[PDB]
Each structure stands twice: as C-alpha cells, then as structure tokens.
Design a protein around this ligand. Structure first.
Ligand code: PAR
Ligand code: MG
Ligand code: MG
Ligand code: MG
Ligand code: MG
Ligand code: MG
Ligand code: MG
Ligand code: MG
Ligand code: MG
Ligand code: MG
Ligand code: MG
Ligand code: MG
Ligand code: MG
Ligand code: MG
Ligand code: MG
Ligand code: MG
Ligand code: MG
Ligand code: MG
Ligand code: MG
Ligand code: MG
Ligand code: MG
Ligand code: MG
Ligand code: MG
Ligand code: MG
Ligand code: MG
Ligand code: MG
Ligand code: MG
Ligand code: MG
Ligand code: MG
Ligand code: MG
Ligand code: MG
Ligand code: MG
Ligand code: MG
Ligand code: MG
Ligand code: MG
Ligand code: MG
Ligand code: MG
Ligand code: MG
Ligand code: MG
Ligand code: MG
Ligand code: MG
Ligand code: MG
Ligand code: MG
Ligand code: MG
Ligand code: MG
Ligand code: MG
Ligand code: MG
Ligand code: MG
Ligand code: MG
Ligand code: MG
Ligand code: MG
Ligand code: MG
Ligand code: MG
Ligand code: MG
Ligand code: MG
Ligand code: MG
Ligand code: MG
Ligand code: MG
Ligand code: MG
Ligand code: MG
Ligand code: MG
Ligand code: MG
Ligand code: MG
Ligand code: MG
Ligand code: MG
Ligand code: MG
Ligand code: MG
Ligand code: MG
Ligand code: MG
Ligand code: MG
Ligand code: MG
Ligand code: MG
Ligand code: MG
Ligand code: MG
Ligand code: MG
Ligand code: MG
Ligand code: MG
Ligand code: MG
Ligand code: MG
Ligand code: MG
Ligand code: MG
Ligand code: MG
Ligand code: MG
Ligand code: MG
Ligand code: MG
Ligand code: MG
Ligand code: MG
Ligand code: MG
Ligand code: MG
Ligand code: MG
Ligand code: MG
Ligand code: MG
Ligand code: MG
Ligand code: MG
Ligand code: MG
Ligand code: MG
Ligand code: MG
Ligand code: MG
Ligand code: MG
Ligand code: MG
Ligand code: MG
Ligand code: MG
Ligand code: MG
Ligand code: MG
Ligand code: MG
Ligand code: MG
Ligand code: MG
Ligand code: MG
Ligand code: MG
Ligand code: MG
Ligand code: MG
Ligand code: MG
Ligand code: MG
Ligand code: MG
Ligand code: MG
Ligand code: MG
Ligand code: MG
Ligand code: MG
Ligand code: MG
Lengths: 138, 124
RNA sequence: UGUGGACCCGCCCCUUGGGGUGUGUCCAAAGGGCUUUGCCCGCUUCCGGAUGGGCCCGCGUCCCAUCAGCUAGUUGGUGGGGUAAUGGCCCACCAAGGCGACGACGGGUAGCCGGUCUGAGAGGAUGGCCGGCCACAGGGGCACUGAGACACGGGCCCCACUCCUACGGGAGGCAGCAGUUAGGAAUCUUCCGCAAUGGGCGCAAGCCUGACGGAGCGACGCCGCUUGGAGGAAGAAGCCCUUCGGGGUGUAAACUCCUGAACCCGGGACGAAACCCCCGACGAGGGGACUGACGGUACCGGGGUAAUAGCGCCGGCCAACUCCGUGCCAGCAGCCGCGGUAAUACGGAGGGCGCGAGCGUUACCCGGAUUCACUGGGCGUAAAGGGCGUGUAGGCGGCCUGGGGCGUCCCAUGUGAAAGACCACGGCUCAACCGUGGGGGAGCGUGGGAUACGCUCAGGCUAGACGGUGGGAGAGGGUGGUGGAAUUCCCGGAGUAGCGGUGAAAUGCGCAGAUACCGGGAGGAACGCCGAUGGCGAAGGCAGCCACCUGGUCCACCCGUGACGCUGAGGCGCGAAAGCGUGGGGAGCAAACCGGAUUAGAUACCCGGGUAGUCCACGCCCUAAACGAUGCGCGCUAGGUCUCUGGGUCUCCUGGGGGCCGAAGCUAACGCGUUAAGCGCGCCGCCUGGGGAGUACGGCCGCAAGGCUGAAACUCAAAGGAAUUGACGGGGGCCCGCACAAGCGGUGGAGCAUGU
RNA sequence: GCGGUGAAUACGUUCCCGGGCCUUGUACACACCGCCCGUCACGCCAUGGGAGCGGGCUCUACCCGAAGUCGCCGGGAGCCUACGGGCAGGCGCCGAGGGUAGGGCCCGUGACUGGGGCGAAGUCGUAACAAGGUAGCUGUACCGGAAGGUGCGGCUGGAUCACUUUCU
RNA sequence: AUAA
RNA sequence: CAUACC
C-alpha cells in the first residue's frame, strides 16, 4: 500500500522535475494540497489545481524550471533543487519554535504543520509556534 | 537498519582489548629473568636479537626485549619491563627498562641517552 | 491541681488517621544562683514555628539471552502483633494468586550524584580533589540506653587472628592524626597552634577539639621568576666540512661598559574584635581591656656578586644533512620500513630543528573513527539478504466529516543548592589562586490555551484488499493406470574365430560357440523427436500418454463487501544431492573395493570388473555456488525491439509473464536502467579488518553421520573488490624466419692443429 | 679478402626453435626459469579434552544451636511489696553459626592427550592460478604419505573444444 | 635454495 | 650482489 502519501507526492514531484515535465498528477488530499499552497506561494511551482483523472480526485501540480543554459547540456536549472521528507512514519519529527531549522540560511524553506496550520519556517518563528517538521525544500 | 530495529536492538559499542597485559594497567612491571636468549627476526630481517623470558610480580611469564648494543642480564637477573612491541620478533610485546634494577645502562653512549638510561658524561 | 492533652463511645464539619464537641476514665513539674521579695538559669503540660529525619510513589540509572521461565510469605483477603508511622514488616486463618521477551530468574561488574575529560555537536569516557546522599568500622548476628544508634574510639554472643596467663581464665580492633611493616611501577611529618573559623558542655571565667588554621616533605600539577642587558671581527682558538679557493659553529666567545638573582643590614605586618568588664536596662547604644600558631614570615627601605641548562629529535608521515665507523653484523623501528662495502633511517662527531626546570618514555580515556553511522554507514561482485513459505506478537497504514486532547506545540508559574562552567568588576606587584555581581540551563511539577499532523471514539467513501460472473495458458502437486525405443539377462534359430577396448595396449569375454543377425520371453530404470530464444511453481524443483483428485495464476464484465491492508521476531510447515532406519527391488550406472595399463612413483586421470548407492514405500536427516551470490510490499521516472499468454474498434490498441537495447539517473568500476542496482515510504533479516574458526564451550535438535547457535587466548598489516598496462598460456586467429620439411655437404669416430 | 668450376632441393605449415599483430584467461609484475598447496622435520608461543588431587560460593532435607528480643510460667520453690505487682529463675518460638546426606556453579592444579599460530635459505610431491595440462568451486559420502582422488547432485565465479610430460 |  | 644448505 501507499505508506506515506506525503513522501509519495514530494517524490512524485522530484521525479517529474528531473525529466522536466510541464506538470504532474498527485492523488489528492487537503493536507497534500495545503502544502502545494506553500510550494506555490514561496515560488517553487507554478501552482496546482484539482483536476480529475478517471473519476477520482487528483491535484495537478504545474512545475517550474530555469532558463535554457550554455555549453554542452542546455537543460535548465531546477527551481526545486532539493526537496526531502523529514518527519516520516515510525520516525515522527517534532520541533519547538526555538528549534525550527534555518534552511540554507533561508535560501530554502521548511514546511511544518502546527496547530495554527501548515506553515513555512519563517512563518512559524515569526508567529511563535512549532510542530511536526514535514520537509525541507531548497 | 530501520529505526524500529535500532529501537529493538540498537548499536553495540566497541570493546578495546589491550595490546599489553602488564596487568594493573600499570606503566611498568618488575620481574626476574628466567632465561636470556638470542632470537632470529622474520620478514626481510636478519640479526641476533637479545630477549629475556621474565616472570613478573604480575604473576605472568612474558618475553621482553633487551635494547641497546651491550647488555648484562643473566638467568636470575631482576628487571623492569615496560611495554613496546618489537616489530620483528613475533610475541615480543614489552621492552625492558635500561637503567633500572639489575639491567645496566648502555655504556659510553652519547646520543639518545635517557632511553638506554645512561648518566651525563662529565667534564668541563 | 487539669490551662490543657491522651483513650473509648456518640454527634458536627471535613474526607483515609484531618478539625471541632459532649459524658466517662487517664496524665504534670525541680530545683539552683545571686547585685536576695526580685531578677538570672532551670522544670512541667499544651499549640505553633524553625531545622533535621522516617516511610510511600512516577520517571531515569552497566554488561551477558551461551541466564527463559521465576515465586510458597510467594500474590491478595480478614483479624492480630509491631512501629513515631503505612505496609506480608511479622503472625494465625482464608482465597490461588503474583512476575516475565517492554528481559522476569540467574550470572558478571560497580558506591550514586553535582561534576570531570574529550568532542563542532550528537555522543563517548569517567566519578580522583571539593560539595550532597548512601554504605561500612577485623568477619557474622543482636539488642539495650536514648529525641536520635542497631552506635568506628558503647554493650552481648559466635568466628578468625595478635597479646597477657598461676591452664581456670582474661585483653585488643588507625578504613581518626601522625608513624611502622607488608604488597607495589608508585604515593608525605611519629611537625606547630587552638591566634582565626566551627563544634560539645558551662550562667560565666573556661575546658575539650589530629575538626580546623599553619608549617613540613615530593618539579606531582598549574601559574609566576632567574642563569643577564647594550656594544663586539668582515669575522681568534679548537672541533667540523671542502671542489685545497674555501665554507660552518658565529655576535657566539674573548673583551668594553650597564643593571644586580643569590647573599648581608635595618623597619616589620594584615588576619583581631568579639566573648569578658564599665555607663545605659543584663535591651538598643557608647566607652575599656585581653588575645597571632603561621612569624622576624609577607611586605617596605639600604648594601650588593655576572650568577644552574637540560632533554628529545633531524628517511616519509613530521620542523631539522654533512663526515667517520659498521657490512643481513652490531643495531633501529609508532606505522611504512632502514643495515648485504660509497647508510641524510644503525653507533660517534660537527651542524640543525623543537621545547626548556624541564624534556622524553610507558600506561590509560576521548579525538581524528560517519570505523556501531540519531546527527552520520552499509549488504549484485569488497563483510553482509534468512534455502522458501505460512503466519503469532510487534512495527507501519488510503480518502471525507465530527467529538475528545494521549502524543505534539504555546503562555504563565514552581524546582533546577553551593562549588565548577560563561561574562563583567575587583583582592594578592601579574598570574595561578580567590572575592563580589550578572547570565544561561536539559529535565521533571502545576495552572491556562492551540488542534494541522500522530493517537483514540463515532459516522461516511471506493481508488487499496478481498469476493461474484464469464473466459484462458501451464513439465505446478498427489493417486491409479498404461505406451514404444534402448540396455541387460533367459530360450530358440542361423552362423565361426574372434569380440571388446586404447595413444598404444593389456586385464576381460569367447570352441561349454562368444561378437555380429533373426524370432520369442523376463525384468529394472529413464522417457527420443516435439524442445528454446519456451512454460509452471514461494523456494527446493517440475517434462511419454490417459483418468481422477487438487494448488497457484492471468484477462474481460465493473456485479458485491467497504481499509477487511503491508511486513513479520518467535512458532509451524516445505526443502536438490549425499547420508540414516525398516522392508522391498535391482536392468544400466557406479564411492569403496579387485584387477589391467601409464608413470620416476600413480594409493589418480585411461581400461576390464564391482558392493553400498542410484529405484519404491514408510520414517528420519535440513545441507548447498539452497545463486539473479540482488528480502517482501506499494508508488513514481523516455523509448526501441524479440517472445509467451489473454482482451478489443484486431495497419494496431490494451493487460499479465519472459529476454535484449537503451532516456534520465545511479555505480569503485563492471554494470544496472518500468523484470532498477533509479527516485521514495513501510517492515523483517544480516555486516563491522585477516587468521585462529563455523573451531572450542554451553545449550537445543538427530538412531547415526552431523545440524543450529557460536566465542576467546594468541597472531598479522594486511586480507579484499573492480579495472589498467604488460608479460605469460601445454587459449584462439592471422603471419613470418634454412624453423622444420625437401635437398646437398658436414661435425660427433681417426691422426694432427688451435682454443677450453 | 680474391677470383676459377659450379649443383640439389623447397610439395607444404602438421610437428621442432624463434619472432610480429589481433583477440581471450590470469591468483603472474625481478612478469611461467612466475606464482602457489599440503603432510613432514627443527624451534618459540597461546590453547581445547582430561582420570585424579587441592580451594571457594550457593541450594534442598534432617539434626544440634550462642547472644538477644518477644511469648508462657513464675509454684508453702529464692528476694522485694502498699497484696495490686515487680525482680531472680525457668521453659518455648525465632535465631548467627555448626554438623550429616544429596545436588548445582566458580577458580587453581594435573599424568595423559587433540589441534592451532608464528619463525630467510631442512623433506616429499605438484593440488590451485593460462583449457594449470583430468575446468574449477561446491554440499555430502567413502578412500589415500601429503597436497588430494572418486561417486552423486548443484553453481559459472569455465577456456570453448584432436595419449601421460615434474621442478626452477 | 634465500633475501634485493 | 650478499648469503644458505646437499
Ligand atoms: N603458518 C603456516 C601454516 O602451516 C603450514 O606451513 C608451515 C609448514 O608447512 C612450513 O614449512 C616450510 C616448508 O613448506 C618449506 N618447503 C621449507 C621451509 N623452510 C619451511 O618453513 C618453516 O620452517 C623453517 C625452519 O625449518 C622456518 O625457518 C620457517 O620460518 C618456517 N616457515 O612452514 C610453516 C610454518 O611457518 C601450512 N601450509 C600453512 O597453510 C599454514 O598457514
Ligand atoms: Mg607503543
Ligand atoms: Mg634513535
Ligand atoms: Mg481537662
Ligand atoms: Mg476532659
Ligand atoms: Mg472521617
Ligand atoms: Mg472525636
Ligand atoms: Mg495525678
Ligand atoms: Mg527560687
Ligand atoms: Mg517540619
Ligand atoms: Mg498464604
Ligand atoms: Mg494490619
Ligand atoms: Mg494484615
Ligand atoms: Mg537481574
Ligand atoms: Mg563501594
Ligand atoms: Mg554523567
Ligand atoms: Mg565525531
Ligand atoms: Mg581518593
Ligand atoms: Mg569522592
Ligand atoms: Mg583493617
Ligand atoms: Mg580507632
Ligand atoms: Mg616492595
Ligand atoms: Mg578554637
Ligand atoms: Mg570557639
Ligand atoms: Mg651579548
Ligand atoms: Mg641598587
Ligand atoms: Mg656595580
Ligand atoms: Mg577566649
Ligand atoms: Mg548596671
Ligand atoms: Mg552593648
Ligand atoms: Mg657571564
Ligand atoms: Mg623536513
Ligand atoms: Mg670524503
Ligand atoms: Mg659486529
Ligand atoms: Mg659508509
Ligand atoms: Mg646501500
Ligand atoms: Mg644520520
Ligand atoms: Mg629516523
Ligand atoms: Mg581534533
Ligand atoms: Mg564516533
Ligand atoms: Mg561501511
Ligand atoms: Mg568471493
Ligand atoms: Mg560477499
Ligand atoms: Mg534469496
Ligand atoms: Mg536455516
Ligand atoms: Mg546463503
Ligand atoms: Mg507474510
Ligand atoms: Mg498483525
Ligand atoms: Mg494502528
Ligand atoms: Mg492516516
Ligand atoms: Mg479527529
Ligand atoms: Mg495533550
Ligand atoms: Mg549550581
Ligand atoms: Mg562543556
Ligand atoms: Mg587585578
Ligand atoms: Mg559566582
Ligand atoms: Mg512544565
Ligand atoms: Mg502543562
Ligand atoms: Mg476542536
Ligand atoms: Mg471507518
Ligand atoms: Mg472469481
Ligand atoms: Mg504437471
Ligand atoms: Mg543363442
Ligand atoms: Mg545350427
Ligand atoms: Mg582365455
Ligand atoms: Mg570344439
Ligand atoms: Mg549380445
Ligand atoms: Mg532379441
Ligand atoms: Mg530380472
Ligand atoms: Mg527458459
Ligand atoms: Mg520464476
Ligand atoms: Mg535452478
Ligand atoms: Mg484451478
Ligand atoms: Mg462496483
Ligand atoms: Mg455501501
Ligand atoms: Mg532433503
Ligand atoms: Mg536421496
Ligand atoms: Mg536406504
Ligand atoms: Mg536385497
Ligand atoms: Mg560397469
Ligand atoms: Mg571403472
Ligand atoms: Mg545397507
Ligand atoms: Mg523418502
Ligand atoms: Mg488475435
Ligand atoms: Mg513486459
Ligand atoms: Mg547515461
Ligand atoms: Mg559509467
Ligand atoms: Mg540494460
Ligand atoms: Mg520498486
Ligand atoms: Mg549497490
Ligand atoms: Mg550469517
Ligand atoms: Mg575473524
Ligand atoms: Mg578477528
Ligand atoms: Mg558446517
Ligand atoms: Mg556443542
Ligand atoms: Mg543424543
Ligand atoms: Mg581482481
Ligand atoms: Mg596472447
Ligand atoms: Mg633438414
Ligand atoms: Mg674428431
Ligand atoms: Mg610460436
Ligand atoms: Mg605487423
Ligand atoms: Mg600480445
Ligand atoms: Mg602491443
Ligand atoms: Mg589487449
Ligand atoms: Mg613453475
Ligand atoms: Mg582445563
Ligand atoms: Mg568442594
Ligand atoms: Mg533448637
Ligand atoms: Mg536463648
Ligand atoms: Mg526471664
Ligand atoms: Mg542456620
Ligand atoms: Mg597442477
Ligand atoms: Mg608448470
Ligand atoms: Mg579454473
Ligand atoms: Mg577414513
Ligand atoms: Mg579441496
Ligand atoms: Mg579412489
Ligand atoms: Mg561433478
């Protein structure tokens, strides 16, 4: 079965971008969606939208890359350089507000889930909470 | 392994067995010579090597090496051993202190004097 | 006497034995001193405070599972005893419980902590000075007295040891300060003082303190300080090297002047102002007196001498090279390694490098070691995927909504002693050392809040999973049956001199007629072609044909259930071959064995025989190169091509399976690449340098053979994987050469010449 | 060095010796006159099994049992008394330790004995690495001075294929 | 035979 | 090259 559906998405995305797709489909959940809301806001995607494949509900993510490059290998720079699940099943990772990590000196984000809802690193620290550290993205 | 496995079992820490049971831990140990011998090296070495079988206040019978060109140890000489394998004679792990007990300091030695244990050549 | 307290019973409040209240009963005392009618110190009962304790609880606290079962006061009940007090703390009676893989029970090791060392940190190691708690006082028990002891310098008893002994009997207890002795690599004075601080008793004066404050020994550690400072040759002597010119030690020395550690003389402490005494009141307050172990020390002033330098190193790692001696010796060596007659690696010398009242060595801890990896590793070939399944516990778990608020997060608050650690300002001339202040702090307690994610409870869903209906391919498994080819043997026929076998042979078979050939028969075993580029199975493995019994699977329909899922320590089953037990069988083949060859030998390869075995049934054994040397599940990430098997609009589309090539990507490389070794998540298993060793031991299993589990001493600096360039092969392919072959003349014999 | 006279034979590349290029395997690199294996001999070392001796700890049953608390008695059977009672003494439970029987574990010692690991130049062969000259390795079974050989089955981590031919 |  | 044995 699908043991972690968040990693599934996070990965689904990582996979798609490395072959430069225009978009990719993840099967849908509000929680998954509530993450894409942030990916989108912070500039990591072009955004997403609830499409509908074979009558079951998916979230089409629209990916985003650099410009074409120079010399041999013109494949463009990735926008999502790096994106990885931190907390996982059978190793949940929770942090105090005093422990929310500075990712790449802030050049990257770290989505975490708090009782004020899903939030970036900057968001929670400048709002006073902590929670389950979901994933770093940079 | 999986975390649940580290949880279940865990990492086992490493035991570090001594290279030198001069018991006590102690820096040195006294014993008596119960034979002085000559020994052949191995590998690409050849020479005649001075060793002793010592019986220790540790209650241990170990074979020590007798450094220096000149030595004065006999089949009843008391001696102080001190750890320091000799790379060429297998099973020789301790050295003998030159300058302590029956063992004489090396004679007319002028350089590495405190190993070998010789006084300070005196004049003006 | 009864302020008041204690006890029984009743009543109120409270909620565990807390606080009232009524009757009844029970329970108090001690005197001493004077400045002698009032003070000082005592005594008695009760309530409260302070300080110190007892007991109980949550959580945390090393190693071995080669220690898996443990327990009879054991687990709970009732009633007692006991205590300051709860309690199987102890006792009687009753119930039959309690604990354990979240590691009981046993074994091993250990005082625990604040802290200490190390580390970027997470971690690792440690618990020595100092402070807190615990335990012990020759070993084992025990109580007495007390507010407190089961009592280190108190009591009793038993034990071991030393001592006295008139033979019956007694006496001891440094793990208090010193000190002796023993063991050891190794650890101090039988010092001074109660002046300060603290303690005990005393109204006080005082007394007692080996607590303590000081001195003493040891470079054992830290910190501070000296062995001098400025001039001084184009550069003495000696020693060193040399290209025979020189170059080095080197401004170093000598020597010129300048300060003046040591040492001498003089002054000389702080630490000490209280207790006591006087005025006031024996209060507040004021006045007075006494007191220094350290110590004639610290410190201040004058006088004043050029006045200890060692140890390690110099092949690379690793700062620093030249002669001589040695000759695989003598030796060095942390690792790699130096020495075999020209050694920057050995021993000396000159020179040089590094530290310096120290410098080296050995031992031990952390580090580098992401080398037990949580941070932060791996397992196709380097060590590592369990032989395969089924499944227990456990771990983990799709989408939507609501409750709760266990996890998680947040606010407030309590606790986190001092020392130490961090920072500042201070005191010793600095520092070491010490004083003052500030700051931080993991973790636990409480009160309030959040609800995304995890958890749980209640509903809902169909996309995971299972089911239904129709259809398919298959050496998947079990049982009975049956078919032809061959080998062997037996009978008959015909036929005669050999057959067989090898490099060559022999052993062997054959005139009792073999070999070849024909016909008939018995049997045991295995199934040619079809047939692999194939199929089936979880693995081991599975192939003549027929029938029955029976397992897995794939597709179409999108019909039903509604998260029923994944993985899986133990358990249970399965598991080529060989091997074992009991019967059966036995054609061919064939360990052992018996012969023939070969050979230097030939306990082998070759040849002729041949027993177990190979086959069956039943029962064991449980292994393997049990291999894709690649655990299972799910999701994602170009394509091309070949093939097996479904379905559909059937140039092709769409599933499942088997190959090859390759995108991205990965990999040490080789390789892998929708049948991952890519990108991810869940779970199990396993690895931690080589040898010793799959050994020993213990356990468990087996009839056995053995299997499973599985070390240590000791020992090495490697062992390894992939690839590269060579060389090589009794590997391939291509090709040369008087290389052979084809030729013609020689040498090897003779006599002599010449060389050895 | 010089001229005179003046031949034979070569089918062919299988063998013998060398050499070049390409390819394959490799455990070789002072490079096959390479590497390497095991028994055995000499020597040093740690160690398993072990009849029997010496010592420690613990458990079970039975018996003896100091001190001491606690319990019962405390009597014309001792002392005290206010007659209530106290004390002395006595018995008993428990109880340190001791002994008899059986068992479990831990250390020393040890006749005899099994293998191990190391140590330039002792011995026998030549198993492995090239198709290592009989592909190798492997589980198992028997056999042999030794490496090893053979059976059966498995693996490829085997070169791809025409009498034995050891060592450097 | 052994070491380079 | 320097060694070791028959
Ligand atoms: N350590 C070797 C072990 O024993 C064997 O090897 C041992 C013996 O077989 C071997 O003996 C060899 C011998 O083969 C060879 N032909 C001659 C050689 N002189 C011997 O060597 C032995 O003996 C001499 C003295 O005689 C020693 O100086 C030398 O160090 C030692 N290795 O010496 C070894 C002991 O050092 C196994 N083959 C080996 O697998 C195993 O590892
Ligand atoms: Mg050392
Ligand atoms: Mg030296
Ligand atoms: Mg009253
Ligand atoms: Mg009353
Ligand atoms: Mg009450
Ligand atoms: Mg009452
Ligand atoms: Mg009264
Ligand atoms: Mg009076
Ligand atoms: Mg109190
Ligand atoms: Mg009971
Ligand atoms: Mg009670
Ligand atoms: Mg009770
Ligand atoms: Mg225990
Ligand atoms: Mg202790
Ligand atoms: Mg600690
Ligand atoms: Mg580290
Ligand atoms: Mg101490
Ligand atoms: Mg201490
Ligand atoms: Mg003592
Ligand atoms: Mg005493
Ligand atoms: Mg001594
Ligand atoms: Mg005093
Ligand atoms: Mg005092
Ligand atoms: Mg000067
Ligand atoms: Mg002066
Ligand atoms: Mg002067
Ligand atoms: Mg006084
Ligand atoms: Mg007065
Ligand atoms: Mg006053
Ligand atoms: Mg001078
Ligand atoms: Mg250098
Ligand atoms: Mg010269
Ligand atoms: Mg010599
Ligand atoms: Mg020389
Ligand atoms: Mg040389
Ligand atoms: Mg030198
Ligand atoms: Mg050196
Ligand atoms: Mg470091
Ligand atoms: Mg580490
Ligand atoms: Mg590793
Ligand atoms: Mg291998
Ligand atoms: Mg391997
Ligand atoms: Mg497998
Ligand atoms: Mg197994
Ligand atoms: Mg295996
Ligand atoms: Mg399963
Ligand atoms: Mg389950
Ligand atoms: Mg669950
Ligand atoms: Mg969920
Ligand atoms: Mg909910
Ligand atoms: Mg909560
Ligand atoms: Mg503190
Ligand atoms: Mg620190
Ligand atoms: Mg200051
Ligand atoms: Mg402070
Ligand atoms: Mg709290
Ligand atoms: Mg709270
Ligand atoms: Mg809510
Ligand atoms: Mg539900
Ligand atoms: Mg069906
Ligand atoms: Mg079949
Ligand atoms: Mg016939
Ligand atoms: Mg006839
Ligand atoms: Mg005959
Ligand atoms: Mg005849
Ligand atoms: Mg015939
Ligand atoms: Mg016939
Ligand atoms: Mg027959
Ligand atoms: Mg096939
Ligand atoms: Mg298959
Ligand atoms: Mg197979
Ligand atoms: Mg079927
Ligand atoms: Mg349906
Ligand atoms: Mg329904
Ligand atoms: Mg089997
Ligand atoms: Mg069989
Ligand atoms: Mg049988
Ligand atoms: Mg038979
Ligand atoms: Mg035969
Ligand atoms: Mg045969
Ligand atoms: Mg038989
Ligand atoms: Mg059978
Ligand atoms: Mg068709
Ligand atoms: Mg396919
Ligand atoms: Mg590529
Ligand atoms: Mg590559
Ligand atoms: Mg490929
Ligand atoms: Mg996958
Ligand atoms: Mg890999
Ligand atoms: Mg294993
Ligand atoms: Mg090993
Ligand atoms: Mg090892
Ligand atoms: Mg085995
Ligand atoms: Mg065993
Ligand atoms: Mg048995
Ligand atoms: Mg290799
Ligand atoms: Mg070749
Ligand atoms: Mg010829
Ligand atoms: Mg001749
Ligand atoms: Mg050739
Ligand atoms: Mg050419
Ligand atoms: Mg070549
Ligand atoms: Mg070439
Ligand atoms: Mg090549
Ligand atoms: Mg050879
Ligand atoms: Mg033994
Ligand atoms: Mg005994
Ligand atoms: Mg008794
Ligand atoms: Mg008694
Ligand atoms: Mg009595
Ligand atoms: Mg007893
Ligand atoms: Mg061979
Ligand atoms: Mg050869
Ligand atoms: Mg081979
Ligand atoms: Mg045998
Ligand atoms: Mg073998
Ligand atoms: Mg044989
Ligand atoms: Mg075979």
């Amino acid at each position: 079965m699908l043991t972690d559906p968040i990693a599934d998405m996070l990965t689904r995305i990582r996979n798609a971008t490395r072959v430069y797709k225009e978009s990719t489909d993840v099967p849908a959940s509000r929680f998954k969606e509530e993450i894409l809301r942030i990916l989108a806001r912070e500039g990591f995607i072009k955004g997403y939208e609830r499409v509908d494949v074979d009558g079951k509900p998916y979230l089409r993510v629209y990916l985003k890359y650099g410009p074409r490059r120079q010399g041999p290998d013109p494949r463009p720079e990735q926008v999502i350089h790096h994106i990885r699940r931190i907390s996982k099943p059978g190793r949940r990772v929770y942090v105090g507000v005093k422990e929310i990590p500075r990712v790449r000196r802030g050049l990257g984000i770290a989505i975490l889930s708090t009782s004020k809802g899903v939030l970036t690193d900057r968001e929670a620290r400048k709002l006073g909470v902590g929670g389950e550290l979901i994933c770093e993205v940079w | 392994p999986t975390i649940n496995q580290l949880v279940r079992k865990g990492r086992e820490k490493v035991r570090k067995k001594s290279k030198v049971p001069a018991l006590k831990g102690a820096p040195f140990r006294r014993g008596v010579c119960t034979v002085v011998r000559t020994v052949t090296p191995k590998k690409p070495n050849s020479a005649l090597r001075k060793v002793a079988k010592v019986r220790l206040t540790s209650g241990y019978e170990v074979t020590a090496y007798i450094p220096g060109e000149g030595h004065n140890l006999q089949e009843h000489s008391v001696v102080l051993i001190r750890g320091g394998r000799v790379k060429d004679l297998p099973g020789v792990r301790y050295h003998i202190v030159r300058g302590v007990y029956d063992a004489a300091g090396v004679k007319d030695r002028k350089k590495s004097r405190s190993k070998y244990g010789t006084k300070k050549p005196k004049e003006a």
